[PDB]
Design an enzyme around this catalytic site. Sequence first.
Site, PDB file in Angstrom:
ATOM      1  N   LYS A  42       0.998  -1.164  -0.074  1.00  0.00           N
ATOM      2  CA  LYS A  42       0.162  -0.007  -0.066  1.00  0.00           C
ATOM      3  C   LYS A  42       0.756   1.323   0.036  1.00  0.00           C
ATOM      4  CE  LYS A  42      -2.272  -0.625   3.781  1.00  0.00           C
ATOM      5  NZ  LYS A  42      -1.587  -1.827   4.573  1.00  0.00           N
ATOM      6  N   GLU A  58       1.589   5.310  11.727  1.00  0.00           N
ATOM      7  CA  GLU A  58       2.602   4.692  10.845  1.00  0.00           C
ATOM      8  C   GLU A  58       4.011   4.809  11.385  1.00  0.00           C
ATOM      9  OE1 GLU A  58       0.352   2.481   8.741  1.00  0.00           O
ATOM     10  OE2 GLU A  58       2.106   1.547   9.384  1.00  0.00           O
ATOM     11  N   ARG A  59       4.972   4.288  10.643  1.00  0.00           N
ATOM     12  CA  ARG A  59       6.440   4.432  11.118  1.00  0.00           C
ATOM     13  C   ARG A  59       7.185   5.683  10.960  1.00  0.00           C
ATOM     14  NH1 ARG A  59       4.981   0.074   7.587  1.00  0.00           N
ATOM     15  NH2 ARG A  59       4.985  -2.059   8.923  1.00  0.00           N
TER      16      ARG A  59
HETATM   17  N1  ADP Z   1       5.887  -2.722  -6.374  1.00  0.00           N
HETATM   18  C1  ADP Z   1       6.860  -3.414  -5.762  1.00  0.00           C
HETATM   19  N2  ADP Z   1       7.936  -3.992  -6.101  1.00  0.00           N
HETATM   20  C2  ADP Z   1       8.974  -4.603  -5.373  1.00  0.00           C
HETATM   21  N3  ADP Z   1       8.695  -4.964  -4.100  1.00  0.00           N
HETATM   22  C3  ADP Z   1       7.581  -4.462  -3.600  1.00  0.00           C
HETATM   23  C4  ADP Z   1       6.557  -3.614  -4.330  1.00  0.00           C
HETATM   24  N4  ADP Z   1       5.473  -3.411  -3.485  1.00  0.00           N
HETATM   25  C5  ADP Z   1       5.761  -3.762  -2.197  1.00  0.00           C
HETATM   26  N5  ADP Z   1       6.981  -4.835  -2.446  1.00  0.00           N
HETATM   27  C6  ADP Z   1       7.784  -5.320  -1.340  1.00  0.00           C
HETATM   28  O1  ADP Z   1       6.737  -5.432  -0.036  1.00  0.00           O
HETATM   29  C7  ADP Z   1       7.224  -4.612   0.891  1.00  0.00           C
HETATM   30  C8  ADP Z   1       5.999  -3.994   1.788  1.00  0.00           C
HETATM   31  O2  ADP Z   1       5.335  -3.013   0.986  1.00  0.00           O
HETATM   32  P1  ADP Z   1       4.720  -1.827   1.658  1.00  0.00           P
HETATM   33  O3  ADP Z   1       4.222  -1.008   0.527  1.00  0.00           O
HETATM   34  O4  ADP Z   1       5.456  -1.268   2.689  1.00  0.00           O
HETATM   35  O5  ADP Z   1       3.270  -2.510   2.319  1.00  0.00           O
HETATM   36  P2  ADP Z   1       2.183  -2.041   3.058  1.00  0.00           P
HETATM   37  O6  ADP Z   1       2.163  -0.827   3.172  1.00  0.00           O
HETATM   38  O7  ADP Z   1       1.017  -2.649   2.326  1.00  0.00           O
HETATM   39  O8  ADP Z   1       2.187  -2.657   4.566  1.00  0.00           O
HETATM   40  C9  ADP Z   1       8.134  -3.535   0.164  1.00  0.00           C
HETATM   41  O9  ADP Z   1       8.935  -2.982   1.234  1.00  0.00           O
HETATM   42  C10 ADP Z   1       8.897  -4.291  -0.681  1.00  0.00           C
HETATM   43  O10 ADP Z   1       9.732  -5.226  -0.090  1.00  0.00           O
HETATM   44 MG    MG Z   2       2.985   0.761   4.832  1.00  0.00          MG
END
Ligand code: ADP
Ligand code: MG
Lengths: 74, 57, 457, 456, 456
Positions: free
Chosen positions: C153, C179-180
Amino acid sequence: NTIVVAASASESAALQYLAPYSGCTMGEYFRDRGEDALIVYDDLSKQAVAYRQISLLLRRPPGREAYPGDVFYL
Amino acid sequence: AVVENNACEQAARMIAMKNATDNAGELISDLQLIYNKARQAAITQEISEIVGGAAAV
Amino acid sequence: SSGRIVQIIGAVIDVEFPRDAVPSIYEALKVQGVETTLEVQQQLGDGVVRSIAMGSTEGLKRGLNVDSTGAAISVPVGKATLGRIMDVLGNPIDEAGPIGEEERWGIHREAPSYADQAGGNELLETGIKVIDLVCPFAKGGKVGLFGGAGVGKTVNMMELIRNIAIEHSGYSVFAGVGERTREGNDFYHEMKDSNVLDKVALVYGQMNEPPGNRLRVALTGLTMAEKFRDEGRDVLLFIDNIYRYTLAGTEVSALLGRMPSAVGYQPTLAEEMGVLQERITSTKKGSITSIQAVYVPADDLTDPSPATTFAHLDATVVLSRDIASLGIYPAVDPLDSTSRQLDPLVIGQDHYDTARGVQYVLQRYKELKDIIAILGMDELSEADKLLVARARKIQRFLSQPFFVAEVFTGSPGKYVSLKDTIAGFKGILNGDYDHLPEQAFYMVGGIEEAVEKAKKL
Amino acid sequence: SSGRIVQIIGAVIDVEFPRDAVPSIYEALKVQGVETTLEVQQQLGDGVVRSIAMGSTEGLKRGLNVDSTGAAISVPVGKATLGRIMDVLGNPIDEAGPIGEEERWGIHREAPSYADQAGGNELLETGIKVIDLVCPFAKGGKVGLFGGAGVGKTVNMMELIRNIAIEHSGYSVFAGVGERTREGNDFYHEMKDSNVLDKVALVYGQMNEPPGNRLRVALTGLTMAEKFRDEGRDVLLFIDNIYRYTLAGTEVSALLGRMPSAVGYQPTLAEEMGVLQERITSTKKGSITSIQAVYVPADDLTDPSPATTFAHLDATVVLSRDIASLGIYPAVDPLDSTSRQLDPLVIGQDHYDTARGVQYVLQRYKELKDIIAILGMDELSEADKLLVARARKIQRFLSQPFFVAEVFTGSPGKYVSLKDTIAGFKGILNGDYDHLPEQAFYMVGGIEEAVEKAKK
Amino acid sequence: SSGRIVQIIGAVIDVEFPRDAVPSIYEALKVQGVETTLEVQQQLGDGVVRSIAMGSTEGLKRGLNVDSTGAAISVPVGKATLGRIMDVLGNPIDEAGPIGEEERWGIHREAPSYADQAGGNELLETGIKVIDLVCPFAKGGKVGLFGGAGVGKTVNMMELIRNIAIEHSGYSVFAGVGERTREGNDFYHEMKDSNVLDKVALVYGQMNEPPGNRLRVALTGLTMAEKFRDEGRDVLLFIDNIYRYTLAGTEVSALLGRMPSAVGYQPTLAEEMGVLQERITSTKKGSITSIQAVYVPADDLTDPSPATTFAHLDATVVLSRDIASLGIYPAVDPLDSTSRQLDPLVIGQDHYDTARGVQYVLQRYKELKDIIAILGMDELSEADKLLVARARKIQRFLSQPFFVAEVFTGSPGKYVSLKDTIAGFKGILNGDYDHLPEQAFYMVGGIEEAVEKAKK
Ligand SMILES: Nc1ncnc2c1ncn2[C@@H]1O[C@H](COP(=O)(O)OP(=O)(O)O)[C@@H](O)[C@H]1O
Ligand SMILES: [Mg+2]
Ligand SMILES: Nc1ncnc2c1ncn2[C@@H]1O[C@H](COP(=O)(O)OP(=O)(O)O)[C@@H](O)[C@H]1O
Ligand SMILES: Nc1ncnc2c1ncn2[C@@H]1O[C@H](COP(=O)(O)OP(=O)(O)O)[C@@H](O)[C@H]1O
Ligand SMILES: [Mg+2]
């Protein structure tokens, strides 16, 4: 190279709840002076069980699986 | 002999797919009993959490 | 006249006032000598009010004198908030001095009226292929990005901030809700390095803050976006976790004397959701385009908090745990995500038949997957074999490398136009690429890059 | 001084004392007429303590006078407890006179310290093939025997008592906590008939008792084992159902005024488990080897009482109703049973490699169950068919006839050494017995008895 | 002496009385100046009773005077209830004047005692051939009725009302628990047009009523059936849904603040089922036999509401869409309907042999119908073709014209005795009527009417 902080199974649930914060403070001494530290919390689930016991015995109102509402904040 | 063995192969395939349909229905009936047990336990756990939360307020 | 603290249980503090000077509901209160603010939630009778702290309760005692301000929590508004980081109370939490605002606004407000509503249908191009195909956005519309923990997300929100807000001629408000702190610092240095920070106001309440901060920080960001909308401008608003507003409302709820509802939630869940969501909308004075990412607990869409968030949005993008677990990113489930702008009178006939053809082929392959998993590929008919091969190529071509994800992939990012996406998915659907292997369509961008990758396998 | 009973709700009695004479937590009290022992749990204020009776409460009224003893519940310890049966209060229940003890110990004490802990990985051979293979034991270690209703827990413990008694020459303490009174009478008359009764001390608080007795009887048996450990000896401690301590803490929990935790348990569950389980250890003075049977409610291993019990143990033997429904005894799930002695620097590389190969073959057999149920064995590949054949021979060879199960079948019991178990399972995994039928591997001791059973 | 309303929370009303005039449990109370009746549930102390209103509480205030009647809710009983629609209080809800009763009875009484049981396993003849052959009814028995809508449930109920009134000189009582108003008006006009309205007393407790009305409406209809039983008769009692009685108990127990039991139900679920079902028995004066339609929640037979209901049922009648699409009326499945009376100690060997022979021939025809569907009629042997011909003759002889369905079939109705049913189905099973065509066996009475049908 390692500080060991122990709060075992027959000790009080207050010390089991306060042990990760105390070890975190001992790790944060090295962080605040420009050095690097690494910390393991080997069971945060058991810290949640100890804080659930302290919250139920203080008659705070429970929620899902009788955990207190502030447990994510914990 | 080759053409009669081909007809025997198709008859054995008929018997094997009827047996596969019956064993699939047996596994569906066992999993439906496990699902109904889990549904009743989930309703009982949610009501115990609501009653224990309402008694503390 | 001043009151005194009689009870401190967690984040909830009870204050006794004299009977002629009881503060109103949502009045801000100042504790004397300690730098903490209280917001009145309930009037309990006999002069006693129940409140939530907007800071830590470690320095608080019973017997402390509490003054009333006579108004709600007021935050700075105007163009002095641009380029700054503020907390829930509107104090600056950068080190750039004081905010020189000329006006302050209270954070609690009515929703706009039914006669004030105004809805357009102008298309907003994103450059992400699955989002441009199956869920087209609207200018002054509302976007949800549903998904569990770790499915992408924040990375999707950063790609939409790169492909929309950098070339946007107006103003933006970013609201970090529960959030973080690392991601908040990372985003501030990313807008500072790209010379974009002078158009964007940042409001932050992190996950380690007290539950009162996390409960009102989205109202603070929306109040600054409401001032920019009622000035007549076109405003962007990004909320990275609107669920954290709900969850903090869980955390205080039974300590406020409420009996719990189903799945442990507060009984006022839909009303507290509707009070925040009905102010985000675009009016006849100005427009707000909002992008909110919604956390889904344990990937359960039938959990009550995302199921109440589903009705408030115009365009819903649902991220699947299963597709991210196959290594495919952006990981949008193309059968569970809809949009109000998926209409033949809005995007044209050709776009609509391409999107429904993709969804029909994928829904067919969803019913054929376990059959190939049990008996194998040869036991189907010929049209099933052609449709399963075209469907696997559709599922690999939905993937895309991103500019903000180059630290995770190692490969550079791509921007793909809408017409390139429609022509490529129409070329896969018409059988114009039936000879290419399925690995040629994985992480490429345009359909020409899939053809260039097929010569290297 | 003396107090008066103000409240009686079940097993829980509130007694009001004068304000300069309030008794401490865990202090024994005596009702003046009937001599019922109470044990103080809580001080409620106002002079009133809340206590749990060590006996029946029918016939008790409000207004009865209660004396305080000034100390906790103290049981006899030492040499005089051997050969004798006692209850929770230390009174003899074997009709053999008084116990001639020289000292009494209170049943509540703290765990030994971190500096007093003793390490050791010396192997204890049990004679049972699945236990010596996949979850091996150590001297001075802790054993759990998890399982649901009627899957074997007591039969396995009686076999483990019989085979661990071969190379052990010290004392033993047996504690019956909430189990069958007929099982206590059978075990006492068996030890009295075979003249090993004078090494074993017996404590019993069974399913017929009020829940204070079931709540406190394991502390009495552990106090006797702690006296034998602190004299510098090597002692065995056997506890049939430790789950029944925990369930007694369920039965008094709402009567003590506590809010319930998840699935109706007491909120102090892990602390009562930790305060009991951290006294069972070996120290630098002497050693305790402990075997405990652990009940699993409604066959659910994710129920909170076994799930809290799992981290207190060195070796864990999980029994299964499905494996016993296949006819395989001692019914051990080999993919769910672990021990910390299964480590190549303790047992050697050969035994570890045989155990990992057995667990690999049984895991890949477990992954093919639905496809074998729907389409059969014939549509597997050839190496898969060979692995299913070797897996069924491994599953049949893990069973064993027991000496204590001679009444159930008539087949004689077998003792198998560790070397024969490693050599036999290595010979099954290498392909040396691919020509044998699988029913020749069922209910034999060695692999050589499978060789003689194949020619029949 | 009268009391005053002190509390109105929903349908739960607390009324305070003087201390020497507290009214009894289940006593009916009347609000002064208003048409509102209350039923006492609990005595809370200090003169205050907690009660459930038997109507809407909109417009009630605290301070209203409440009179006590001295007894429970009393309904009119006797011959004057026949042909009339009534509510839970016995007031008429058709616009046809007052009920001219001679007697009023209270709706709460005990079950008949152990010495008042009639004994034996006497059958109730219905006159329907599939019911008296495959799933026979007992006097004093209970019948679960299953199936959806549009397969002939109402026509079977009117035919049972007509048959018990004309051929056995008894009466019928309908109690609609959770009655939809559209379907109750339809059922009333269908019973006027089938001339069976004057044989049945109708009590409705409608869906838009508060749940104490829907809880006590079956007790009202059972009280009228008890007066009809105490005039020396054999009475039928129809309950429209027993699950809505159970759910009205859940709602009333949730309004009083009781702690709920497993899967959401009331903790008095088996007791509230047993108070209703133990009054439906065969006594020394007469009998009440009940026909109760059953809804199953979430298609789960191990849910607590059907598991409590199936412990009281003596027979099940399953209605089928596939039998009704073949034109066979009534649409009773002969393989899915069960009975506890289908037992050779109860009904004799001859009836049991004829019914199990019919059930074997229909089960063998059910699997051979899939054989004919998979491979054609040429796969079957001469004995398989003979069984298919006899089975189609058995399947058409289960159909029967009804007296209340003469608009539908265009034929006179038939009443068939049990002797003629056993003799006719034995005559088909022994091959005595293989020379007749199968279409002679459709929609006749006995086997002789099929014999005279096959000459035309
Ligand atoms: N488009 C992408 N391409 C490559 N890796 C991705 C991508 N989206 C997410 N990831 C991987 O998944 C992890 C979690 O994504 P994140 O956006 O932090 O999730 P959320 O916000 O839904 O918790 C990223 O830090 C990365 O390691
Ligand atoms: Mg996140
Ligand atoms: N090794 C075994 N051989 C044969 N039967 C056994 C064996 N272990 C258990 N059983 C059968 O299972 C029953 C229950 O065993 P038991 O040890 O009492 O179970 P638990 O302690 O789990 O309740 C025995 O009485 C016997 O019938
Ligand atoms: N004995 C019968 N003979 C002929 N047709 C019948 C008979 N019973 C029912 N039917 C047909 O089935 C339909 C449904 O019957 P009904 O009892 O009204 O079901 P429901 O009450 O559930 O609507 C009727 O309209 C009628 O045409
Ligand atoms: Mg046992």
